[PDB]
mmCIF file of C-alpha atoms and ligand atoms in Angstrom:
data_model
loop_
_atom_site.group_PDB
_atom_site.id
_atom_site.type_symbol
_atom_site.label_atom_id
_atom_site.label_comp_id
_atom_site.label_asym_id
_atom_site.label_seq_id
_atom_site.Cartn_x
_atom_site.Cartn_y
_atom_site.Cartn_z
ATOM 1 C CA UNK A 1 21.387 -23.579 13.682
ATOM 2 C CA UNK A 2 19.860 -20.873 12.184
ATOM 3 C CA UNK A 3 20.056 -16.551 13.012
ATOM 4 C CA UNK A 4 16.256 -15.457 12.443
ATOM 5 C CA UNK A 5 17.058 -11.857 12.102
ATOM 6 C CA UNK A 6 13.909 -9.987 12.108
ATOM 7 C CA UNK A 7 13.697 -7.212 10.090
ATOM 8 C CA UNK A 8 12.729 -3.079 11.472
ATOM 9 C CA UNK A 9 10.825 -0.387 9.792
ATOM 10 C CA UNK A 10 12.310 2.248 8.112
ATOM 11 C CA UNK A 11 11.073 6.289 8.817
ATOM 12 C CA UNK A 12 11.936 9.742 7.750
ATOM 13 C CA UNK B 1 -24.372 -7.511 -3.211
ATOM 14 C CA UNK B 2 -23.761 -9.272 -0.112
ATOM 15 C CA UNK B 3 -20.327 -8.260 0.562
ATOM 16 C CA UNK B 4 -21.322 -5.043 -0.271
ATOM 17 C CA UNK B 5 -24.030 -4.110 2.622
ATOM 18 C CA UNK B 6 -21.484 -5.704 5.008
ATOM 19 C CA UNK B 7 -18.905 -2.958 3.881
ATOM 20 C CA UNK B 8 -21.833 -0.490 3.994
ATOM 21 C CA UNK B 9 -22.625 -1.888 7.217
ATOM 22 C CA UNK B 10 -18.867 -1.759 8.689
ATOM 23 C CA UNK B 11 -18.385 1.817 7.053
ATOM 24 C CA UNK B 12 -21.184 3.115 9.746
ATOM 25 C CA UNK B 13 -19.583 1.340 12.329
ATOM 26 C CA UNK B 14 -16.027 2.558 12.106
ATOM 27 C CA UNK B 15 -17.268 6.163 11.837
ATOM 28 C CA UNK B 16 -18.986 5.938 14.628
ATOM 29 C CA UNK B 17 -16.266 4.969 16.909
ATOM 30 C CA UNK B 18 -13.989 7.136 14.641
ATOM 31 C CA UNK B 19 -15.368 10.153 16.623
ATOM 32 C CA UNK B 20 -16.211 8.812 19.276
ATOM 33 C CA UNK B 21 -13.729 10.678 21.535
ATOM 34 C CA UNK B 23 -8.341 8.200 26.531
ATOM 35 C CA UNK B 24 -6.571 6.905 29.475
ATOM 36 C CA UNK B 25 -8.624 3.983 30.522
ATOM 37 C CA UNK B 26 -6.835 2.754 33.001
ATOM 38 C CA UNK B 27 -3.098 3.143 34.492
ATOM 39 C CA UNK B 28 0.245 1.090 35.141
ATOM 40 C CA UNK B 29 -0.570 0.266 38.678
ATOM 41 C CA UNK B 30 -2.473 -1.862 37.426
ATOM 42 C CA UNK B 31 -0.888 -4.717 35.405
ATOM 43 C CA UNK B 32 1.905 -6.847 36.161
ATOM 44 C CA UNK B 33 5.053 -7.244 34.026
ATOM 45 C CA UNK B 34 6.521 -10.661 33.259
ATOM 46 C CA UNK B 35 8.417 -10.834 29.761
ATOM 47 C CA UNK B 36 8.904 -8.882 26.548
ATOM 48 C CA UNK B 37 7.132 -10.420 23.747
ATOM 49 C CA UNK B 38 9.514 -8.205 21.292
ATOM 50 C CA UNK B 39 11.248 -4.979 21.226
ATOM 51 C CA UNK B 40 11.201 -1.621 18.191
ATOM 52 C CA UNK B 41 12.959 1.418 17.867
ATOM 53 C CA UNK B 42 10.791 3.567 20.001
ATOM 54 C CA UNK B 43 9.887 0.741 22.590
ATOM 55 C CA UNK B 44 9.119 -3.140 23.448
ATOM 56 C CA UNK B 45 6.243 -4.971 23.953
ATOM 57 C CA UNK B 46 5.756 -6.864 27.060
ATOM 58 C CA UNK B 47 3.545 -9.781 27.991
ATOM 59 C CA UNK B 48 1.604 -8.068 31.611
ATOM 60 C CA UNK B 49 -1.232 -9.275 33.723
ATOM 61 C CA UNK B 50 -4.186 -7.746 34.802
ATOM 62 C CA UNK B 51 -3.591 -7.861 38.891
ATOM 63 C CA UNK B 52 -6.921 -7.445 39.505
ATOM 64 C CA UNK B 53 -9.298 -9.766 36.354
ATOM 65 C CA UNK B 54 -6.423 -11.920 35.944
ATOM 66 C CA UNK B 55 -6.252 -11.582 32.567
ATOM 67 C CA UNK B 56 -2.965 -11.925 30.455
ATOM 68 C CA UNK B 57 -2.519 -9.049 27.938
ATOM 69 C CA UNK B 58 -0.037 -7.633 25.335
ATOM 70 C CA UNK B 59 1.404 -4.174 26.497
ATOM 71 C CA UNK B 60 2.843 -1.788 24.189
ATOM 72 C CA UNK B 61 5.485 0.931 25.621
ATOM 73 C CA UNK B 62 6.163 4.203 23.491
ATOM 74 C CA UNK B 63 8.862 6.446 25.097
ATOM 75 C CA UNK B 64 7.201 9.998 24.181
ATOM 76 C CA UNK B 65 10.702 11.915 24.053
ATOM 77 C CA UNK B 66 11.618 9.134 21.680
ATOM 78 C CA UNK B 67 8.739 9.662 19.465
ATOM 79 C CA UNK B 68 8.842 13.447 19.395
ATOM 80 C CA UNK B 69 12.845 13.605 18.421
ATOM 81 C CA UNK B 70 11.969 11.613 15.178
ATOM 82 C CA UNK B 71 8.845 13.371 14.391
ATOM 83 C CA UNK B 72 6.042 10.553 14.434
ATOM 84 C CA UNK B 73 3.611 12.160 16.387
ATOM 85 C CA UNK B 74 1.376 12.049 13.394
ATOM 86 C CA UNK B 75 2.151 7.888 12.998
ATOM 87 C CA UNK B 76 1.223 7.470 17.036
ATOM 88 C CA UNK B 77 -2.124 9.352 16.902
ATOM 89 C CA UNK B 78 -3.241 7.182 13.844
ATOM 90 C CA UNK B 79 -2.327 3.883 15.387
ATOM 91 C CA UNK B 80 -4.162 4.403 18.323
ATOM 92 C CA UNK B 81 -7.157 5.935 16.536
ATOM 93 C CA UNK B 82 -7.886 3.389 14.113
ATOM 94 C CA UNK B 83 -7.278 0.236 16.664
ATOM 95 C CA UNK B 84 -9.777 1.394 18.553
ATOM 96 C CA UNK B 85 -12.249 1.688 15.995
ATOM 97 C CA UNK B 86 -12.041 -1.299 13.222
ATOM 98 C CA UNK B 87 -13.801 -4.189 13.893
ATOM 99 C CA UNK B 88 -12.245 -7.829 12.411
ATOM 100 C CA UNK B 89 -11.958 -11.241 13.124
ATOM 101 C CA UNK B 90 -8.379 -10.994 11.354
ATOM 102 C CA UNK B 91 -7.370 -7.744 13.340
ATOM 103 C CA UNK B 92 -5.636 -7.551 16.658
ATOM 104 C CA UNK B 93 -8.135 -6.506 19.553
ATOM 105 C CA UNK B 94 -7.531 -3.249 21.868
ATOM 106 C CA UNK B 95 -8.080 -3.416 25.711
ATOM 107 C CA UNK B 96 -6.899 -0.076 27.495
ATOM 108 C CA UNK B 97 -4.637 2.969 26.441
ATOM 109 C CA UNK B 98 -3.412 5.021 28.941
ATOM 110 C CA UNK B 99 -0.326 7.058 29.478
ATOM 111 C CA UNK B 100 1.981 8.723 32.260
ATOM 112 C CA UNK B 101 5.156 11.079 32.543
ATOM 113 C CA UNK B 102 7.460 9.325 30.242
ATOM 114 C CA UNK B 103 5.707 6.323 27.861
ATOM 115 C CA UNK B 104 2.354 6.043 25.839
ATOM 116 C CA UNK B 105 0.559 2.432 26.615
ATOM 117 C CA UNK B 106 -1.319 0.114 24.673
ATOM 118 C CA UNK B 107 -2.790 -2.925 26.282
ATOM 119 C CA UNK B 108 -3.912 -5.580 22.877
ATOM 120 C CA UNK B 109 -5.253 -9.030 23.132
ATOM 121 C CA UNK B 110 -2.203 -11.604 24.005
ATOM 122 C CA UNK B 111 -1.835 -13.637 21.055
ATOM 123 C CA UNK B 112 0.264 -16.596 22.470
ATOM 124 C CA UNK B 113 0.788 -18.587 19.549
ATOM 125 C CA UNK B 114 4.146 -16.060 17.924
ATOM 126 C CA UNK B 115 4.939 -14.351 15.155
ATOM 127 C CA UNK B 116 4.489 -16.109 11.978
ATOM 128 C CA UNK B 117 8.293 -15.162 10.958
ATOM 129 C CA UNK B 118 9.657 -17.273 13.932
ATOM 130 C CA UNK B 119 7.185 -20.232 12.659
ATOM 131 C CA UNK B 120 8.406 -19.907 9.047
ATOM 132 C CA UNK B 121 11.983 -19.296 9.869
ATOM 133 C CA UNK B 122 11.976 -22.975 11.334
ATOM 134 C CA UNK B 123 9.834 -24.566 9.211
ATOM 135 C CA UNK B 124 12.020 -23.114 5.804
ATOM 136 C CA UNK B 125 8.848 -22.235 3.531
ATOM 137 C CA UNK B 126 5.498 -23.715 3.614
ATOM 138 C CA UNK B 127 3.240 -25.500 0.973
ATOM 139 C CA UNK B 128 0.902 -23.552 -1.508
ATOM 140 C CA UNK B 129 -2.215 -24.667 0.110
ATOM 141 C CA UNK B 130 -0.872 -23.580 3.752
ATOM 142 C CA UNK B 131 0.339 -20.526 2.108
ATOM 143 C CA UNK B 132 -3.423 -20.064 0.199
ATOM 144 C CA UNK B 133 -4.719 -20.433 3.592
ATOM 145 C CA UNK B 134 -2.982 -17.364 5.111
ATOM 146 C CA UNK B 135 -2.956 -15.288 2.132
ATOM 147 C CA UNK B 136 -6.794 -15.881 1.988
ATOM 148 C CA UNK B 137 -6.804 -13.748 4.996
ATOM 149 C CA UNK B 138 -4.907 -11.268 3.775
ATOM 150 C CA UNK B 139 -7.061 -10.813 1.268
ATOM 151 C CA UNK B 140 -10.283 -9.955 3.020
ATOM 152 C CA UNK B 141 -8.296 -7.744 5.299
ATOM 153 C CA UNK B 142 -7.193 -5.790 3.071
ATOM 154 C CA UNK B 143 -10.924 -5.974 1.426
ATOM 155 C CA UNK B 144 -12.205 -4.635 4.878
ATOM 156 C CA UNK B 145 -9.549 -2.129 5.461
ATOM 157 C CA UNK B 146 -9.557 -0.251 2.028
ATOM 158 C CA UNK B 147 -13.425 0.165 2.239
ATOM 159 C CA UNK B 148 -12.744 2.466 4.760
ATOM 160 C CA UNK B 149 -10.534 4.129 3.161
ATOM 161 C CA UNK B 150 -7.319 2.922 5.247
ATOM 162 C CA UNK B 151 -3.665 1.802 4.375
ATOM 163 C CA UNK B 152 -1.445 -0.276 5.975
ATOM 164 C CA UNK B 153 2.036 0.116 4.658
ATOM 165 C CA UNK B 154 3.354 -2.576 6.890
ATOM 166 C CA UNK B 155 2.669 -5.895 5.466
ATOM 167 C CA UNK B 156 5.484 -8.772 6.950
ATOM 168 C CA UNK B 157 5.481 -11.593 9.235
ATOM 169 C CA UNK B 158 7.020 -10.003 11.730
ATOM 170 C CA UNK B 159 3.055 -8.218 11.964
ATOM 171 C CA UNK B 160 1.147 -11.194 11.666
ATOM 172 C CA UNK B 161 0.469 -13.548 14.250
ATOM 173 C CA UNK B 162 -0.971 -16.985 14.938
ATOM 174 C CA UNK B 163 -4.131 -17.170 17.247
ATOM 175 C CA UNK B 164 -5.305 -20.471 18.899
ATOM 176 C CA UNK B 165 -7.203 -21.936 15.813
ATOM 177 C CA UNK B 166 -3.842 -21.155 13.368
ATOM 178 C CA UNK B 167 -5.353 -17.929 12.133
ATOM 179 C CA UNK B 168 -3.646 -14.862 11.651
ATOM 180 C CA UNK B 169 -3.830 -11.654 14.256
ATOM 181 C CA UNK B 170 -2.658 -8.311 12.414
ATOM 182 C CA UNK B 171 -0.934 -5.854 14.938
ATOM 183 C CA UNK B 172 1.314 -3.092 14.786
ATOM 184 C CA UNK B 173 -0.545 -0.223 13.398
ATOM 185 C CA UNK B 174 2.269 1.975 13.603
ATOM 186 C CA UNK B 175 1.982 3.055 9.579
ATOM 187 C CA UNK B 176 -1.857 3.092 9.307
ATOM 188 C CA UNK B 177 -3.594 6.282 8.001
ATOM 189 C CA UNK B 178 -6.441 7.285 6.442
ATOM 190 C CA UNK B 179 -6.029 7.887 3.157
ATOM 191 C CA UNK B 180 -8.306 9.120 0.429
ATOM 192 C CA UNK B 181 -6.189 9.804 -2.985
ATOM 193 C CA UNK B 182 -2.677 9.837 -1.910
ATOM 194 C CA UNK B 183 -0.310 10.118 0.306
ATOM 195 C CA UNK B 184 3.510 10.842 0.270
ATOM 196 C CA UNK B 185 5.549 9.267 3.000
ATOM 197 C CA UNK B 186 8.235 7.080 3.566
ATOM 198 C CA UNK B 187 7.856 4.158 5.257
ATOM 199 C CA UNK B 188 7.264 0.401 5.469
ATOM 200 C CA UNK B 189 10.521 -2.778 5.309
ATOM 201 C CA UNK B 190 13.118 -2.298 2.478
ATOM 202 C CA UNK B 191 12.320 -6.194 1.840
ATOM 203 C CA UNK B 192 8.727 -4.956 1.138
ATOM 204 C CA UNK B 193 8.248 -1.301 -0.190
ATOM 205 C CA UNK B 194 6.779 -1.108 -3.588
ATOM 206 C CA UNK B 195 8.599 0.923 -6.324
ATOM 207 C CA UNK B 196 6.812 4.220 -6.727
ATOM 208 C CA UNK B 197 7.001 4.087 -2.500
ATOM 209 C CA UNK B 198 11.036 4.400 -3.506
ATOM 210 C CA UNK B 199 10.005 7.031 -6.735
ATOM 211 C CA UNK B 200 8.067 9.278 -4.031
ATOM 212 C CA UNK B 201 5.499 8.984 -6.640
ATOM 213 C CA UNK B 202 2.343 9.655 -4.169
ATOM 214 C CA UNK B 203 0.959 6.353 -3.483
ATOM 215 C CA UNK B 204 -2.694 5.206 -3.310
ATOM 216 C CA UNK B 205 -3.872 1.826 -1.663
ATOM 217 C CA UNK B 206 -2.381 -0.219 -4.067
ATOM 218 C CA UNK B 207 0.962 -0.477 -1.907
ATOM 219 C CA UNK B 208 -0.469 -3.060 0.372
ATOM 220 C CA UNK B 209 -1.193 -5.061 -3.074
ATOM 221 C CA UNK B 210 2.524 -5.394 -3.586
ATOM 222 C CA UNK B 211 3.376 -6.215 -0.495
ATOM 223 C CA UNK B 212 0.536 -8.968 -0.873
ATOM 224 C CA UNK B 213 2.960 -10.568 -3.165
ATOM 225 C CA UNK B 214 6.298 -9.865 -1.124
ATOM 226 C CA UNK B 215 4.451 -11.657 1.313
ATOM 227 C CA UNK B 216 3.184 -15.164 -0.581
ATOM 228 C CA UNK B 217 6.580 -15.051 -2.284
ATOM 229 C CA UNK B 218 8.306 -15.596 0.984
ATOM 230 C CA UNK B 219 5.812 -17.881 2.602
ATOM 231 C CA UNK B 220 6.132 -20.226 -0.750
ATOM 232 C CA UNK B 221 9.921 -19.652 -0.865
ATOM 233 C CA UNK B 222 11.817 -19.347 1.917
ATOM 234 C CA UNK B 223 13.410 -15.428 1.342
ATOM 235 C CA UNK B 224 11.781 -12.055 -0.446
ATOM 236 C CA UNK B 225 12.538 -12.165 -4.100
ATOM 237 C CA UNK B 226 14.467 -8.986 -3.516
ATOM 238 C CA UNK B 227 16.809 -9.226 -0.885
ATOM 239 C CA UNK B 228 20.591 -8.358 -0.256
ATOM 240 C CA UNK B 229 23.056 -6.799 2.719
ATOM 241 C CA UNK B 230 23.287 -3.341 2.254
ATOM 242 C CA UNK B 231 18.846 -1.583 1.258
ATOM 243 C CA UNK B 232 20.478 -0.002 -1.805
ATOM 244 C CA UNK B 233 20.740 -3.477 -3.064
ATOM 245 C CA UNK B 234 17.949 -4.207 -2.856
ATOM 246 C CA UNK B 235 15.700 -1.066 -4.347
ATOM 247 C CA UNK B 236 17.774 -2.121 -7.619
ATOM 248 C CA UNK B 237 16.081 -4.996 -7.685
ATOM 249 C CA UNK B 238 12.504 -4.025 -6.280
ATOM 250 C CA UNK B 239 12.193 -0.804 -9.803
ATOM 251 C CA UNK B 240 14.051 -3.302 -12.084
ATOM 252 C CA UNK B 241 10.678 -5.060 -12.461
ATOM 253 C CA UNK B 242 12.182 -8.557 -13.072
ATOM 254 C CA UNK B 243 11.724 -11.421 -10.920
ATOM 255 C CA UNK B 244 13.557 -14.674 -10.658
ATOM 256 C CA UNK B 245 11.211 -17.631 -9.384
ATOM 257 C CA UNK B 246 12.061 -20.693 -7.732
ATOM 258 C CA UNK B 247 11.400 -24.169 -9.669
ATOM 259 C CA UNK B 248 9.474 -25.680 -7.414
ATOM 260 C CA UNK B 249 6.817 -22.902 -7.642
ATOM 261 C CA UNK B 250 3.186 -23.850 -9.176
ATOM 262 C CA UNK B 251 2.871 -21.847 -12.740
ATOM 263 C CA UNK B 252 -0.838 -20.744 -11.157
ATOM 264 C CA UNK B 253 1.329 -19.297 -8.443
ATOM 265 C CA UNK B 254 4.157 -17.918 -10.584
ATOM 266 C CA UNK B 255 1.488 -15.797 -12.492
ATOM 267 C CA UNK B 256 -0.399 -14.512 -9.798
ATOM 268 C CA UNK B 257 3.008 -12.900 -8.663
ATOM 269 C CA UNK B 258 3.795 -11.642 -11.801
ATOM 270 C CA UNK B 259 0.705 -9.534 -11.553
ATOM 271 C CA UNK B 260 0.579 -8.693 -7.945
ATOM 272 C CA UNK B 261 4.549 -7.915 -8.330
ATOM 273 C CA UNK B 262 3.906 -4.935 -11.477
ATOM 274 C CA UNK B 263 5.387 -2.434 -10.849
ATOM 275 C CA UNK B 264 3.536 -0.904 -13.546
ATOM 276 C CA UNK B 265 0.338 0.802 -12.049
ATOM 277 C CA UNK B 266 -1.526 0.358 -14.967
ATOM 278 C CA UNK B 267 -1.663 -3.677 -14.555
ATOM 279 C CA UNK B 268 -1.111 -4.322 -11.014
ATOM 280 C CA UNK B 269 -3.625 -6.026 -9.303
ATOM 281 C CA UNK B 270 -5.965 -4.958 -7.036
ATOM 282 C CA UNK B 271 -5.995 -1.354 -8.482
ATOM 283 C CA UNK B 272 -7.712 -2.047 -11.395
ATOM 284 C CA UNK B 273 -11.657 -1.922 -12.704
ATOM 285 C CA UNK B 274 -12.853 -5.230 -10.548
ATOM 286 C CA UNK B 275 -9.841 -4.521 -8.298
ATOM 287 C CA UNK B 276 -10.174 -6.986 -5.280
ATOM 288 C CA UNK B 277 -12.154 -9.714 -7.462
ATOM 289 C CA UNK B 278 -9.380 -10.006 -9.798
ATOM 290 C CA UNK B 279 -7.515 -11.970 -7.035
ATOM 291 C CA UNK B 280 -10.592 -13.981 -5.346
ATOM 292 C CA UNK B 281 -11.576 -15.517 -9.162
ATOM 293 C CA UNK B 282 -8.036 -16.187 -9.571
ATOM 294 C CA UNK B 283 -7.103 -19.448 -10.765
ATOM 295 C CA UNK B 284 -5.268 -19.992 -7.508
ATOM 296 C CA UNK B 285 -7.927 -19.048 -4.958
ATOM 297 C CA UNK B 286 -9.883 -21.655 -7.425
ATOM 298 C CA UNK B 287 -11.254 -24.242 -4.280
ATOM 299 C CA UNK B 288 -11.081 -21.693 -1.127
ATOM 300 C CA UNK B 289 -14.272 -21.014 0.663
ATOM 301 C CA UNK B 290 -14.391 -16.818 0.710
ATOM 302 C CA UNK B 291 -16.914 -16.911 3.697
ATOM 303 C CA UNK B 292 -15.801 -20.080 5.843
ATOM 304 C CA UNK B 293 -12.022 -18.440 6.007
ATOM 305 C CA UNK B 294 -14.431 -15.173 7.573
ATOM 306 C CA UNK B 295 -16.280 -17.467 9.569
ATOM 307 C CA UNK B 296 -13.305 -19.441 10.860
ATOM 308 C CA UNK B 297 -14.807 -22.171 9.623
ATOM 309 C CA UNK B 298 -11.800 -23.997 7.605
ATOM 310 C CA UNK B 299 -9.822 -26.441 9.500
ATOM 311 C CA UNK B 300 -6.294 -25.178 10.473
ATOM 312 C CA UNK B 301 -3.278 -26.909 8.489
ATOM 313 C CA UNK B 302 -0.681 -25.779 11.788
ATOM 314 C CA UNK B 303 -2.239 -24.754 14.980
ATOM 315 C CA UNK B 304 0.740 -23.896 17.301
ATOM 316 C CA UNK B 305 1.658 -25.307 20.678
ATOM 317 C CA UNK B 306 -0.208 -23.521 23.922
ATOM 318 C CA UNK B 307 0.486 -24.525 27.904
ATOM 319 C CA UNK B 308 -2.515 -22.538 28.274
ATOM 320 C CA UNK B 309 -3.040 -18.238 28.249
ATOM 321 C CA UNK B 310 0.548 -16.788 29.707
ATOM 322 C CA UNK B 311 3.050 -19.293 27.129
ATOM 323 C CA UNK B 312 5.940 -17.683 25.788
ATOM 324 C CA UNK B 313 7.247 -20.343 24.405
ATOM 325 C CA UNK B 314 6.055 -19.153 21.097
ATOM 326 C CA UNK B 315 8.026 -15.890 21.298
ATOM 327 C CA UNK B 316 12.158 -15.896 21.077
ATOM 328 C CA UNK B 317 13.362 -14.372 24.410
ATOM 329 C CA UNK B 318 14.867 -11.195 24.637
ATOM 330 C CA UNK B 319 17.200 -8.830 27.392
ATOM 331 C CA UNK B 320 14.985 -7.720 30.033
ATOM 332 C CA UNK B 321 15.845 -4.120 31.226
ATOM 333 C CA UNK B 322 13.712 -1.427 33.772
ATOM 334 C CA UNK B 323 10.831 0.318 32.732
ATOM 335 C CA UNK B 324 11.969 3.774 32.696
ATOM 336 C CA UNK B 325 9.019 6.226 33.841
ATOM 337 C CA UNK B 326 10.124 9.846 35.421
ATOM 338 C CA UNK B 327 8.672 12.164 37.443
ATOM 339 C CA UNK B 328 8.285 15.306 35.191
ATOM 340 C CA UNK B 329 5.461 15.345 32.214
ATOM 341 C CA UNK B 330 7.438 14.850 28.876
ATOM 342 C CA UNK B 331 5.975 16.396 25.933
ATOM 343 C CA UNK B 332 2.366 16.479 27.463
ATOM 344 C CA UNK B 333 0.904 19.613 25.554
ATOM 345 C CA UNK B 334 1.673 16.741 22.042
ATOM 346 C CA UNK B 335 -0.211 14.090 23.228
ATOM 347 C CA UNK B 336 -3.483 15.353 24.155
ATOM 348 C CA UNK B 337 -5.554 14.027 21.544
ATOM 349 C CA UNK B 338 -3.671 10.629 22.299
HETATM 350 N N1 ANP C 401 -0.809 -8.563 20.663
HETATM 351 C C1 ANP C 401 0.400 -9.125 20.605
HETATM 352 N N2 ANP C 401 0.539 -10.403 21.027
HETATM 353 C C2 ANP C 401 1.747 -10.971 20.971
HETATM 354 N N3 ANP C 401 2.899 -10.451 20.542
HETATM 355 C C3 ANP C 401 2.731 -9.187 20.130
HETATM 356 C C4 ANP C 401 1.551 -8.467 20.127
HETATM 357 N N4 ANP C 401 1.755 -7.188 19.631
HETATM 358 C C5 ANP C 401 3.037 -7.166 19.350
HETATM 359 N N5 ANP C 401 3.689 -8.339 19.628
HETATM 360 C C6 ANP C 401 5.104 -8.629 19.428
HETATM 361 O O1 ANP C 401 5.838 -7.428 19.583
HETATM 362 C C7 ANP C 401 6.723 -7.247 18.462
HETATM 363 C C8 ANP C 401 6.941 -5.774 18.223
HETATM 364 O O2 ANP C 401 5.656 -5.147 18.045
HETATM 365 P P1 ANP C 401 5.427 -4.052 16.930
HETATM 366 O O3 ANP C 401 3.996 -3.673 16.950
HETATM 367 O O4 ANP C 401 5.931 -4.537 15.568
HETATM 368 O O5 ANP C 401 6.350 -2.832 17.355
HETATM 369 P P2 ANP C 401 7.161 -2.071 16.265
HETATM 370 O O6 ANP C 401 8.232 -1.168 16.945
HETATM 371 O O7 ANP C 401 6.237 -1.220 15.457
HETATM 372 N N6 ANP C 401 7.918 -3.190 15.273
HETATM 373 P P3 ANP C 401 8.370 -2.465 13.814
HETATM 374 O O8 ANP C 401 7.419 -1.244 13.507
HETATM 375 O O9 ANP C 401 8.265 -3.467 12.709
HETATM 376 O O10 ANP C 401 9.863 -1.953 13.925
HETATM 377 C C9 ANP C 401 6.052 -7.999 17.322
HETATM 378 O O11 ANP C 401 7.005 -8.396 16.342
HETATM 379 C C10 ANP C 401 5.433 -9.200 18.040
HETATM 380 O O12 ANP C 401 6.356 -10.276 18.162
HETATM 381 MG MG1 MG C 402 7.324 -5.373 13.646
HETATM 382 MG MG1 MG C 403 5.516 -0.476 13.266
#
């Protein structure tokens, strides 16, 4: 098992 | 020079195209089958031309979205430099169009996934396959600063795996011309380089840092700054200090320690030679400069393809409806779009 969480960009 | 009357040669190229100006073609036209991956202001679906039969990459942009969070500015400059740069390394551009409610982009389908879902599985992957796709970094970045562009948005979530196992850069969302500084937030928390966090007014040596975010992780396994809530993690990212794994090379471990300065004064590739400092490098010791340009190096991983149309390569996602209204929303905005 593993969760591959992918990770967003952050604005403002 | 050689390099240097190619980026002579490229500089004339981009300009051209950079003024060059729209709505090449229209929705009818494509047909939907499954989202490739989804953002905070849209998804990105794999379509097919009806009509050529081609399989493409569509990119959806709600424009009431976009507007609330002010990033008009960001949407103009990802469309306007796609369009215009020219590399081997770069994701291609097919047709941008829009209608009442969603800006399109149509890029080149790139079936072979993200490289996160590739090294997520794997764990980490050896210095010379990590040399091979940092390589490529490398003279992207080369390219892309000649012409006086940034990318802010360095991760494996961006990069993706062609047919041959080398690497397609996409979303442009953070790209911007940039000649001196510049002063806005943005980029990953995993990946932002200190004076990004400082609001110091940052040149084109942020993609530098996240050079070595990046190689970190690929050698590793996880960014050498990392934790659950961000705030953890900008502690750690203008502390300066770095804690490396054992199993790293010592040629490795030193080429982060200068990539990951946060001191502007020694970081690499914003210095007198700035991009030969990391070519001559006692890593990039045996790689062949012009056979990575020329796609000439044999692939370490080439992934899996039951021909153009595979998503096997992407993880799947809820599928919802296309939302598209009948009234113009925020037209008078997006004009030069
Ligand atoms: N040309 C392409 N071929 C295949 N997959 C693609 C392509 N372009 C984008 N994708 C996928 O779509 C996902 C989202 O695209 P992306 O351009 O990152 O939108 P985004 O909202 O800007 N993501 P982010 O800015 O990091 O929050 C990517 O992570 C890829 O998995
Ligand atoms: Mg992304
Ligand atoms: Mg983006």
């Amino acid at each position: 098992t593993c969760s591959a969480i992918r990770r967003a960009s952050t604005i403002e | 020079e050689s390099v240097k009357e190619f980026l002579a040669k490229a500089k004339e190229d981009f300009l051209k195209k950079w003024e060059t100006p729209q709505n090449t073609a229209q929705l009818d036209q494509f047909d939907r089958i499954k989202t490739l991956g989804t953002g905070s202001f849209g998804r990105v679906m794999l379509v097919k031309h009806k009509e050529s039969g081609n399989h493409y990459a569509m990119k959806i942009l709600d424009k009431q979205k976009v507007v609330k969070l002010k990033q008009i500015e960001h949407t103009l400059n990802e469309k306007r430099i796609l369009q215009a740069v020219n590399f081997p390394f770069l994701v291609k551009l097919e047709f941008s169009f829009k209608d009442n409610s969603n800006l399109y982009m149509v890029m080149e389908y790139v079936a072979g996934g993200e490289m996160f879902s590739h090294l997520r599985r794997i764990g980490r992957f050896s210095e010379p396959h990590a040399r091979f796709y940092a390589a490529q970094i490398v003279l992207t970045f080369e390219y892309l600063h000649s012409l006086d562009l940034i990318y802010r948005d360095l991760k494996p979530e961006n990069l993706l795996i062609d047919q041959q196992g080398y690497i397609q850069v996409t979303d442009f969302g953070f790209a911007k011309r940039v000649k001196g500084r510049t002063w806005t937030l943005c980029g990953t928390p995993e990946y932002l380089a200190p004076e990004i966090i400082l609001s110091k007014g940052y040149n084109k040596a942020v993609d530098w840092w996240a050079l070595g975010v990046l190689i970190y992780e690929m050698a590793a396994g996880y960014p050498p700054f990392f934790a659950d809530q961000p705030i953890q993690i900008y502690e750690k990212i203008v502390s300066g200090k770095v804690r490396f794994p054992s199993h790293f090379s010592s040629d490795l471990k030193d080429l982060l320690r200068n990539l990951l300065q946060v001191d502007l004064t020694k970081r690499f590739g914003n210095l007198k030679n700035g991009v030969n400092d990391i070519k001559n490098h006692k890593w990039f010791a045996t790689t062949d400069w012009i056979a990575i340009y020329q796609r000439k190096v044999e692939a370490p991983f080439i992934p899996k393809f039951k021909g153009p149309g595979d998503t096997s390569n992407f993880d799947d996602y809820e599928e919802e409806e296309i939302r598209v209204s009948i009234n113009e929303k925020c037209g008078k905005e997006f004009t030069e779009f």
